[PDB]
Amino acid sequence: DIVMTQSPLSLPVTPGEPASISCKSSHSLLHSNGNNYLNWFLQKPGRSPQLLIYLGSSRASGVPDRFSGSGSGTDFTLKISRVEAEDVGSYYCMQAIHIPSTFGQGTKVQITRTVAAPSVFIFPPSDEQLKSGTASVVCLLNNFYPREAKVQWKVDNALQSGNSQESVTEQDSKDSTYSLSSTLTLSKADYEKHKVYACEVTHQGLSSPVTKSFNRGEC
Amino acid sequence: EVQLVQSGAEVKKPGESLKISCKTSGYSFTNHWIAWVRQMPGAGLEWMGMIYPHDSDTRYNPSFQGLVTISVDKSITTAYLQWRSLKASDTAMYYCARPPFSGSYEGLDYWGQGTLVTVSSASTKGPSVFPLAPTAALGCLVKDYFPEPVTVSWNSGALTSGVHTFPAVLQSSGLYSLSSVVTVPSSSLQTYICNVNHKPSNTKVDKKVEP
Ligand SMILES: OC[C@H]1O[C@H](O)[C@@H](O)[C@@H](O)[C@@H]1O
Protein backbone atom coordinates (compact mmCIF):
# COMPACT_ATOMS: atom_id res chain seq x y z
CA ASP A 1 0.00 0.00 0.00
CA ILE A 2 0.98 3.62 -0.50
CA VAL A 3 1.88 5.51 2.68
CA MET A 4 0.77 9.14 2.89
CA THR A 5 2.86 11.31 5.25
CA GLN A 6 1.38 14.64 6.26
CA SER A 7 3.31 17.39 8.00
CA PRO A 8 2.98 19.11 10.36
CA LEU A 9 0.40 17.05 12.29
CA SER A 10 -0.49 20.19 14.28
CA LEU A 11 -0.51 23.63 12.65
CA PRO A 12 -1.00 26.86 14.63
CA VAL A 13 -1.87 29.85 12.46
CA THR A 14 -3.36 33.39 12.81
CA PRO A 15 -6.36 34.57 10.73
CA GLY A 16 -5.21 36.66 7.79
CA GLU A 17 -1.89 34.83 7.60
CA PRO A 18 -0.99 32.16 5.02
CA ALA A 19 -0.76 28.49 5.93
CA SER A 20 0.41 25.43 4.02
CA ILE A 21 0.32 21.64 4.60
CA SER A 22 2.66 19.02 3.12
CA CYS A 23 1.58 15.55 1.94
CA LYS A 24 4.31 13.14 0.82
CA SER A 25 3.49 9.79 -0.79
CA SER A 26 5.75 6.75 -0.75
CA HIS A 27 4.90 6.13 -4.43
CA SER A 28 4.20 8.35 -7.41
CA LEU A 29 0.59 9.43 -7.77
CA LEU A 30 1.17 10.56 -11.37
CA HIS A 31 -1.06 8.55 -13.71
CA SER A 32 0.00 7.65 -17.26
CA ASN A 33 -2.78 10.00 -18.35
CA GLY A 34 -0.92 12.95 -16.79
CA ASN A 35 -3.04 13.57 -13.67
CA ASN A 36 -1.95 13.20 -10.05
CA TYR A 37 -4.56 11.23 -8.10
CA LEU A 38 -4.34 13.22 -4.88
CA ASN A 39 -7.35 14.92 -3.22
CA TRP A 40 -7.48 17.18 -0.15
CA PHE A 41 -10.31 17.20 2.41
CA LEU A 42 -11.29 19.26 5.44
CA GLN A 43 -13.17 17.57 8.31
CA LYS A 44 -14.68 20.06 10.74
CA PRO A 45 -15.64 18.95 14.26
CA GLY A 46 -18.76 16.81 14.25
CA ARG A 47 -19.00 16.80 10.45
CA SER A 48 -18.06 14.55 7.53
CA PRO A 49 -15.01 15.32 5.36
CA GLN A 50 -15.54 17.90 2.59
CA LEU A 51 -13.58 18.06 -0.65
CA LEU A 52 -11.23 21.01 -1.06
CA ILE A 53 -8.90 20.03 -3.94
CA TYR A 54 -9.09 17.13 -6.38
CA LEU A 55 -6.55 15.70 -8.84
CA GLY A 56 -3.68 17.63 -7.30
CA SER A 57 -4.69 21.21 -8.08
CA SER A 58 -8.37 21.59 -9.07
CA ARG A 59 -10.35 23.60 -6.55
CA ALA A 60 -13.66 21.93 -5.85
CA SER A 61 -16.91 23.78 -6.49
CA GLY A 62 -17.84 26.17 -3.69
CA VAL A 63 -14.44 26.11 -1.98
CA PRO A 64 -13.19 29.68 -1.35
CA ASP A 65 -10.33 30.54 -3.66
CA ARG A 66 -7.99 31.08 -0.70
CA PHE A 67 -7.56 27.29 -0.90
CA SER A 68 -5.21 25.99 -3.57
CA GLY A 69 -3.31 22.80 -4.21
CA SER A 70 -0.12 22.05 -6.09
CA GLY A 71 2.45 19.31 -6.49
CA SER A 72 3.19 16.34 -8.69
CA GLY A 73 4.66 12.89 -8.31
CA THR A 74 5.16 12.30 -4.59
CA ASP A 75 5.22 15.82 -3.03
CA PHE A 76 1.97 17.76 -2.68
CA THR A 77 0.98 20.94 -0.87
CA LEU A 78 -2.30 22.42 0.28
CA LYS A 79 -2.02 26.18 0.75
CA ILE A 80 -4.43 28.57 2.44
CA SER A 81 -3.62 32.10 1.32
CA ARG A 82 -5.41 34.01 4.15
CA VAL A 83 -6.59 31.79 7.01
CA GLU A 84 -10.02 32.50 8.49
CA ALA A 85 -11.30 31.58 11.94
CA GLU A 86 -13.72 29.13 10.29
CA ASP A 87 -10.87 27.04 8.85
CA VAL A 88 -10.27 25.19 12.13
CA GLY A 89 -10.49 21.43 11.72
CA SER A 90 -8.50 18.47 10.42
CA TYR A 91 -7.12 18.28 6.87
CA TYR A 92 -6.49 15.01 5.03
CA CYS A 93 -4.92 14.01 1.77
CA MET A 94 -5.99 10.82 -0.01
CA GLN A 95 -4.37 8.96 -2.91
CA ALA A 96 -6.46 7.16 -5.52
CA ILE A 97 -3.77 5.70 -7.82
CA HIS A 98 -3.52 2.30 -6.05
CA ILE A 99 -6.13 0.06 -4.45
CA PRO A 100 -6.66 0.36 -1.54
CA SER A 101 -7.04 4.16 -1.36
CA THR A 102 -5.09 5.52 1.61
CA PHE A 103 -5.21 8.76 3.61
CA GLY A 104 -2.69 10.89 5.39
CA GLN A 105 -2.96 10.86 9.16
CA GLY A 106 -4.55 14.32 9.28
CA THR A 107 -3.26 17.79 10.11
CA LYS A 108 -5.08 19.61 12.91
CA VAL A 109 -5.15 23.36 12.24
CA GLN A 110 -5.35 25.38 15.46
CA ILE A 111 -6.43 29.03 15.18
CA THR A 112 -4.27 31.45 17.15
CA ARG A 113 -6.02 34.27 19.02
CA THR A 114 -5.28 36.51 21.97
CA VAL A 115 -5.32 35.11 25.50
CA ALA A 116 -8.83 35.15 26.97
CA ALA A 117 -9.77 34.41 30.56
CA PRO A 118 -12.55 31.91 31.34
CA SER A 119 -15.79 32.97 32.88
CA VAL A 120 -16.28 30.47 35.70
CA PHE A 121 -19.63 29.11 36.94
CA ILE A 122 -20.31 26.48 39.59
CA PHE A 123 -23.50 24.40 39.78
CA PRO A 124 -24.57 22.44 42.86
CA PRO A 125 -26.34 19.11 42.29
CA SER A 126 -30.05 19.28 41.57
CA ASP A 127 -32.61 18.25 44.14
CA GLU A 128 -33.86 15.63 41.65
CA GLN A 129 -30.45 13.94 41.44
CA LEU A 130 -29.86 14.09 45.20
CA LYS A 131 -33.01 11.98 45.60
CA SER A 132 -31.22 9.13 43.81
CA GLY A 133 -28.18 9.12 46.08
CA THR A 134 -25.50 10.68 43.85
CA ALA A 135 -24.28 14.28 43.72
CA SER A 136 -22.76 15.78 40.56
CA VAL A 137 -21.12 19.19 41.10
CA VAL A 138 -20.26 20.93 37.81
CA CYS A 139 -17.76 23.73 37.17
CA LEU A 140 -17.94 25.53 33.81
CA LEU A 141 -14.99 27.42 32.27
CA ASN A 142 -16.45 29.37 29.36
CA ASN A 143 -14.82 30.90 26.26
CA PHE A 144 -11.12 30.90 27.13
CA TYR A 145 -7.82 30.74 25.22
CA PRO A 146 -5.35 28.99 25.17
CA ARG A 147 -6.62 25.48 25.92
CA GLU A 148 -4.39 24.75 28.92
CA ALA A 149 -6.37 25.26 32.12
CA LYS A 150 -6.22 23.73 35.59
CA VAL A 151 -9.36 22.99 37.62
CA GLN A 152 -8.88 22.17 41.31
CA TRP A 153 -11.83 20.93 43.37
CA LYS A 154 -11.93 21.69 47.10
CA VAL A 155 -14.43 20.32 49.63
CA ASP A 156 -14.21 22.04 53.04
CA ASN A 157 -10.86 23.28 51.68
CA ALA A 158 -9.69 19.67 51.22
CA LEU A 159 -8.00 19.03 47.87
CA GLN A 160 -9.93 16.44 45.85
CA SER A 161 -8.37 13.88 43.53
CA GLY A 162 -9.62 10.82 41.69
CA ASN A 163 -13.27 11.88 41.77
CA SER A 164 -13.61 14.33 38.87
CA GLN A 165 -13.67 14.26 35.08
CA GLU A 166 -13.24 16.97 32.45
CA SER A 167 -14.58 17.53 28.93
CA VAL A 168 -13.43 20.27 26.50
CA THR A 169 -15.14 21.63 23.42
CA GLU A 170 -13.47 22.06 20.06
CA GLN A 171 -12.24 25.51 19.10
CA ASP A 172 -15.17 27.77 18.27
CA SER A 173 -15.42 28.56 14.56
CA LYS A 174 -16.11 32.28 15.17
CA ASP A 175 -14.16 33.38 18.26
CA SER A 176 -11.56 30.57 18.41
CA THR A 177 -12.05 29.93 22.14
CA TYR A 178 -12.52 26.73 24.15
CA SER A 179 -14.89 25.82 26.95
CA LEU A 180 -14.42 23.17 29.62
CA SER A 181 -16.65 21.41 32.12
CA SER A 182 -15.41 19.60 35.21
CA THR A 183 -17.77 17.28 37.11
CA LEU A 184 -17.08 16.25 40.70
CA THR A 185 -19.08 13.13 41.63
CA LEU A 186 -19.84 12.14 45.24
CA SER A 187 -22.36 9.91 46.93
CA LYS A 188 -25.26 11.72 48.58
CA ALA A 189 -23.79 10.50 51.88
CA ASP A 190 -20.41 12.11 51.22
CA TYR A 191 -21.96 15.28 49.77
CA GLU A 192 -23.98 15.87 52.96
CA LYS A 193 -20.92 15.49 55.24
CA HIS A 194 -19.52 18.82 54.00
CA LYS A 195 -20.50 22.45 53.48
CA VAL A 196 -18.26 24.43 51.10
CA TYR A 197 -17.76 23.17 47.55
CA ALA A 198 -15.33 25.12 45.40
CA CYS A 199 -13.57 24.88 42.06
CA GLU A 200 -10.38 26.88 41.69
CA VAL A 201 -9.29 27.74 38.14
CA THR A 202 -5.74 28.54 37.01
CA HIS A 203 -5.23 29.97 33.52
CA GLN A 204 -2.90 32.29 31.62
CA GLY A 205 -5.63 34.92 31.31
CA LEU A 206 -6.03 35.15 35.10
CA SER A 207 -3.61 37.20 37.21
CA SER A 208 -4.37 34.84 40.12
CA PRO A 209 -6.49 31.69 40.38
CA VAL A 210 -10.25 32.31 40.48
CA THR A 211 -12.51 30.37 42.86
CA LYS A 212 -16.27 29.93 42.54
CA SER A 213 -17.97 28.19 45.45
CA PHE A 214 -21.26 27.58 47.23
CA ASN A 215 -22.38 26.41 50.66
CA ARG A 216 -24.46 23.24 50.53
CA GLY A 217 -28.13 23.94 51.21
CA GLU A 218 -27.77 27.76 51.24
CA CYS A 219 -29.12 30.00 48.47
CA GLU B 1 -28.40 18.55 -5.09
CA VAL B 2 -26.27 15.49 -4.36
CA GLN B 3 -27.34 13.68 -1.18
CA LEU B 4 -25.78 10.64 0.51
CA VAL B 5 -28.16 9.90 3.39
CA GLN B 6 -26.96 7.11 5.65
CA SER B 7 -28.98 4.99 8.05
CA GLY B 8 -29.08 5.75 11.77
CA ALA B 9 -26.76 4.75 14.61
CA GLU B 10 -26.63 1.01 15.41
CA VAL B 11 -25.90 -1.02 18.54
CA LYS B 12 -25.36 -4.73 17.92
CA LYS B 13 -24.15 -7.74 19.85
CA PRO B 14 -20.80 -9.34 19.01
CA GLY B 15 -21.23 -12.18 16.54
CA GLU B 16 -24.26 -10.58 14.86
CA SER B 17 -24.39 -9.59 11.22
CA LEU B 18 -25.20 -6.02 10.26
CA LYS B 19 -26.10 -4.13 7.09
CA ILE B 20 -26.05 -0.33 6.95
CA SER B 21 -27.38 1.76 4.10
CA CYS B 22 -26.46 4.80 2.03
CA LYS B 23 -29.44 6.32 0.18
CA THR B 24 -28.31 8.50 -2.74
CA SER B 25 -30.18 11.10 -4.77
CA GLY B 26 -29.52 14.06 -7.02
CA TYR B 27 -27.31 12.36 -9.61
CA SER B 28 -26.95 9.38 -11.95
CA PHE B 29 -26.72 6.56 -9.41
CA THR B 30 -25.63 3.74 -11.69
CA ASN B 31 -22.36 5.24 -13.02
CA HIS B 32 -20.70 6.60 -9.87
CA TRP B 33 -18.62 4.42 -7.56
CA ILE B 34 -19.72 4.35 -3.91
CA ALA B 35 -16.92 3.82 -1.38
CA TRP B 36 -17.10 2.99 2.33
CA VAL B 37 -14.65 4.48 4.83
CA ARG B 38 -14.09 3.72 8.53
CA GLN B 39 -13.16 6.33 11.14
CA MET B 40 -12.19 5.04 14.57
CA PRO B 41 -13.08 7.48 17.39
CA GLY B 42 -10.76 10.49 17.25
CA ALA B 43 -8.60 8.66 14.69
CA GLY B 44 -8.01 8.91 10.94
CA LEU B 45 -9.74 7.53 7.88
CA GLU B 46 -9.45 3.99 6.46
CA TRP B 47 -10.82 3.07 3.03
CA MET B 48 -12.73 -0.22 3.09
CA GLY B 49 -13.81 -0.84 -0.49
CA MET B 50 -16.10 0.41 -3.20
CA ILE B 51 -18.73 -0.69 -5.72
CA TYR B 52 -19.77 0.44 -9.20
CA PRO B 53 -23.58 0.04 -9.09
CA HIS B 54 -24.10 -0.46 -12.84
CA ASP B 55 -22.69 -4.01 -12.70
CA SER B 56 -21.90 -4.34 -8.95
CA ASP B 57 -18.20 -4.37 -9.77
CA THR B 58 -16.32 -4.23 -6.45
CA ARG B 59 -12.81 -3.45 -5.22
CA TYR B 60 -11.86 -4.20 -1.62
CA ASN B 61 -9.14 -3.23 0.79
CA PRO B 62 -7.51 -6.65 1.36
CA SER B 63 -7.54 -5.99 5.12
CA PHE B 64 -11.36 -5.83 4.99
CA GLN B 65 -12.02 -8.38 2.23
CA GLY B 66 -14.15 -11.29 3.40
CA LEU B 67 -14.95 -9.40 6.60
CA VAL B 68 -17.42 -7.09 4.82
CA THR B 69 -19.55 -7.17 1.67
CA ILE B 70 -20.64 -4.11 -0.34
CA SER B 71 -23.77 -4.20 -2.51
CA VAL B 72 -26.40 -1.97 -4.13
CA ASP B 73 -30.13 -1.87 -4.85
CA LYS B 74 -30.54 0.19 -8.02
CA SER B 75 -34.34 0.39 -7.74
CA ILE B 76 -33.95 2.69 -4.70
CA THR B 77 -30.46 4.08 -5.56
CA THR B 78 -29.04 2.69 -2.31
CA ALA B 79 -25.67 1.15 -1.43
CA TYR B 80 -25.01 -1.20 1.47
CA LEU B 81 -22.17 -2.32 3.72
CA GLN B 82 -22.52 -5.67 5.50
CA TRP B 83 -20.59 -7.53 8.18
CA ARG B 84 -21.08 -11.28 8.47
CA SER B 85 -20.05 -11.37 12.15
CA LEU B 86 -19.44 -8.16 14.10
CA LYS B 87 -16.47 -7.83 16.45
CA ALA B 88 -15.82 -5.33 19.23
CA SER B 89 -13.14 -3.79 16.98
CA ASP B 90 -15.82 -2.84 14.44
CA THR B 91 -17.08 -0.10 16.77
CA ALA B 92 -16.53 3.05 14.68
CA MET B 93 -18.08 5.69 12.46
CA TYR B 94 -18.66 4.56 8.86
CA TYR B 95 -19.03 6.90 5.87
CA CYS B 96 -20.20 6.35 2.34
CA ALA B 97 -18.63 8.51 -0.34
CA ARG B 98 -18.84 9.30 -4.06
CA PRO B 99 -16.20 10.50 -6.59
CA PRO B 100 -16.51 13.95 -8.19
CA PHE B 101 -17.37 12.52 -11.63
CA SER B 102 -19.08 9.54 -13.26
CA GLY B 103 -17.11 6.55 -14.56
CA SER B 104 -13.55 5.63 -13.58
CA TYR B 105 -12.59 6.01 -9.91
CA GLU B 106 -10.62 9.23 -9.39
CA GLY B 107 -10.90 9.53 -5.62
CA LEU B 108 -13.67 10.90 -3.45
CA ASP B 109 -15.78 14.05 -3.31
CA TYR B 110 -19.15 13.82 -1.54
CA TRP B 111 -19.43 12.17 1.89
CA GLY B 112 -22.48 10.87 3.75
CA GLN B 113 -23.20 12.10 7.25
CA GLY B 114 -21.86 8.91 8.83
CA THR B 115 -23.33 5.96 10.72
CA LEU B 116 -22.12 5.17 14.25
CA VAL B 117 -21.85 1.43 14.90
CA THR B 118 -21.41 0.20 18.47
CA VAL B 119 -20.70 -3.49 19.08
CA SER B 120 -21.42 -4.32 22.70
CA SER B 121 -22.70 -7.07 24.97
CA ALA B 122 -24.42 -4.52 27.22
CA SER B 123 -28.07 -3.52 27.23
CA THR B 124 -29.11 0.01 26.33
CA LYS B 125 -29.70 2.51 29.15
CA GLY B 126 -31.45 5.85 28.79
CA PRO B 127 -30.13 9.00 30.45
CA SER B 128 -31.46 10.91 33.41
CA VAL B 129 -31.55 14.65 32.62
CA PHE B 130 -30.81 17.07 35.46
CA PRO B 131 -30.89 20.88 35.46
CA LEU B 132 -27.83 23.08 35.82
CA ALA B 133 -29.70 26.03 37.25
CA PRO B 134 -28.50 29.66 36.76
CA THR B 135 -24.29 37.05 31.74
CA ALA B 136 -25.77 33.98 33.41
CA ALA B 137 -25.00 30.34 32.69
CA LEU B 138 -27.35 27.36 32.76
CA GLY B 139 -27.68 23.95 31.20
CA CYS B 140 -28.52 20.29 31.44
CA LEU B 141 -26.59 17.29 32.75
CA VAL B 142 -27.38 14.16 30.72
CA LYS B 143 -26.23 11.35 33.00
CA ASP B 144 -25.68 7.60 32.76
CA TYR B 145 -26.52 6.40 29.27
CA PHE B 146 -25.31 3.74 26.86
CA PRO B 147 -24.57 3.60 23.97
CA GLU B 148 -23.66 6.86 22.28
CA PRO B 149 -25.01 9.15 20.86
CA VAL B 150 -27.36 11.64 22.46
CA THR B 151 -28.47 14.86 20.84
CA VAL B 152 -29.19 18.07 22.72
CA SER B 153 -30.78 21.25 21.41
CA TRP B 154 -32.17 24.32 23.18
CA ASN B 155 -35.73 25.62 22.70
CA SER B 156 -36.40 23.27 19.76
CA GLY B 157 -33.36 24.66 17.96
CA ALA B 158 -34.32 28.33 18.31
CA LEU B 159 -31.48 29.02 20.80
CA THR B 160 -28.08 28.29 19.18
CA SER B 161 -25.79 31.22 20.06
CA GLY B 162 -23.75 30.75 23.20
CA VAL B 163 -24.57 27.03 23.43
CA HIS B 164 -21.76 24.56 24.16
CA THR B 165 -22.60 20.86 24.10
CA PHE B 166 -19.62 19.02 25.54
CA PRO B 167 -18.13 15.73 24.38
CA ALA B 168 -19.50 12.85 26.40
CA VAL B 169 -17.24 11.49 29.14
CA LEU B 170 -17.10 7.77 29.89
CA GLN B 171 -17.58 7.36 33.64
CA SER B 172 -16.05 4.66 35.84
CA SER B 173 -19.49 2.99 35.89
CA GLY B 174 -19.05 2.24 32.17
CA LEU B 175 -21.84 4.67 31.21
CA TYR B 176 -21.61 8.01 29.43
CA SER B 177 -22.42 11.46 30.75
CA LEU B 178 -22.48 14.86 29.06
CA SER B 179 -23.38 18.45 29.78
CA SER B 180 -24.84 21.15 27.59
CA VAL B 181 -24.67 24.77 28.68
CA VAL B 182 -25.71 28.15 27.35
CA THR B 183 -24.82 31.69 28.37
CA VAL B 184 -27.76 34.10 28.28
CA PRO B 185 -28.34 37.71 29.33
CA SER B 186 -28.80 37.95 33.10
CA SER B 187 -31.72 40.34 32.58
CA SER B 188 -33.97 37.85 30.79
CA LEU B 189 -34.14 34.73 33.01
CA GLN B 190 -37.31 33.99 28.74
CA THR B 191 -37.96 30.25 29.02
CA TYR B 192 -35.04 27.84 28.62
CA ILE B 193 -35.65 24.21 27.61
CA CYS B 194 -33.05 21.58 26.71
CA ASN B 195 -34.31 18.91 24.31
CA VAL B 196 -32.52 15.58 24.89
CA ASN B 197 -32.97 12.59 22.59
CA HIS B 198 -31.34 9.20 23.18
CA LYS B 199 -32.72 7.21 20.26
CA PRO B 200 -31.24 3.79 21.30
CA SER B 201 -33.42 3.83 24.43
CA ASN B 202 -36.42 5.76 23.04
CA THR B 203 -35.65 8.44 25.66
CA LYS B 204 -36.85 11.96 24.84
CA VAL B 205 -36.85 14.75 27.43
CA ASP B 206 -37.62 18.49 27.39
CA LYS B 207 -36.38 19.77 30.75
CA LYS B 208 -37.31 23.32 31.72
CA VAL B 209 -34.28 24.97 33.31
CA GLU B 210 -35.32 27.63 35.85
CA PRO B 211 -33.50 29.45 38.66
O1 LIG C 1 -13.19 27.02 6.12
C1 LIG C 1 -13.69 27.36 4.85
C2 LIG C 1 -15.00 26.62 4.74
O2 LIG C 1 -16.03 27.41 4.19
C3 LIG C 1 -17.29 26.82 4.31
O3 LIG C 1 -18.04 27.46 5.30
C4 LIG C 1 -17.29 25.32 4.67
O4 LIG C 1 -18.50 24.81 4.14
C5 LIG C 1 -16.07 24.51 4.18
O5 LIG C 1 -16.42 23.75 3.04
C6 LIG C 1 -14.88 25.39 3.86
O6 LIG C 1 -13.70 24.67 4.14
Numbering used by the authors:
A (entry chain L): 1 to 27, 27A, 27B, 27C, 27D, 27E, 28 to 214
B (entry chain H): 1 to 52, 52A, 53 to 82, 82A, 82B, 82C, 83 to 100, 100A, ...
Paper text:
Using LIBRA-seq (linking B cell receptor to antigen specificity through sequencing) data for the B cell repertoire of an individual chronically infected with human immunodeficiency virus type 1 (HIV-1), we identified a lineage of IgG3 antibodies predicted to bind to HIV-1 Envelope (Env) and influenza A Hemagglutinin (HA). Two lineage members, antibodies 2526 and 546, were confirmed to bind to a large panel of diverse antigens, including several strains of HIV-1 Env, influenza HA, coronavirus (CoV) spike, hepatitis C virus (HCV) E protein, Nipah virus (NiV) F protein, and Langya virus (LayV) F protein. Antibody 2526 has a distinct antigen binding profile that includes several strains of HIV-1 Env, influenza HA, and CoV spike, as well as HCV E, NiV-F, and LayV-F. Distinct from the growing class of FDG antibodies that target high-mannose glycans, 2526 exists as a “Y” shaped IgG3 antibody that targets complex glycans.
To identify the binding site and define interactions between sugars and 2526 at a high resolution, the fragment antigen-binding (Fab) of 2526 IgG1 was co-crystallized with mannose, and a 1.8 Å crystal structure was determined. Mannose was observed bound within a light chain pocket formed by residues within framework regions 2 and 3 including: Lys 39, Gln 45, Arg 61, Glu 81, and Asp 82. The mannose binding pocket was stabilized by interactions with the adjacent light chain complementarity determining region 2 (LCDR2). Mutant 2526 IgG3 antibodies, whereby combinations of the residues lining the mannose binding pocket identified in the crystal structure were mutated to alanine, displayed dramatically reduced binding to HIV-1 Env, SARS-CoV-2 spike, and influenza HA. This data implicated the glycan-binding pocket of the light chain as the primary influence on binding to HIV-1 Env, SARS-CoV-2 spike, and influenza HA. Taken together, the light chain of 2526 appears to be most important for binding to HIV-1 Env and SARS-CoV-2 spike, and key residues for such binding include affinity matured residues along with germline-present residues that make interactions within the glycan-binding pocket. Since our data indicates that 2526 requires complex glycans on antigens for binding, it is likely that there are additional interactions between 2526 and its target antigens besides those identified in the structure of 2526 IgG1 Fab bound to mannose. Since our data suggests that 2526 requires processing of antigenic glycans into more complex forms, this binding pocket likely comprises one of several interactions between the antibody and its target glycans, with critical contacts being made with the non-mannose subunits of glycans. It is also possible that the two Fab arms of the IgG3 are interacting with terminal mannose moiety of multiple glycan chains, with the IgG3 hinge conferring the ability to engage spatially separated glycans.
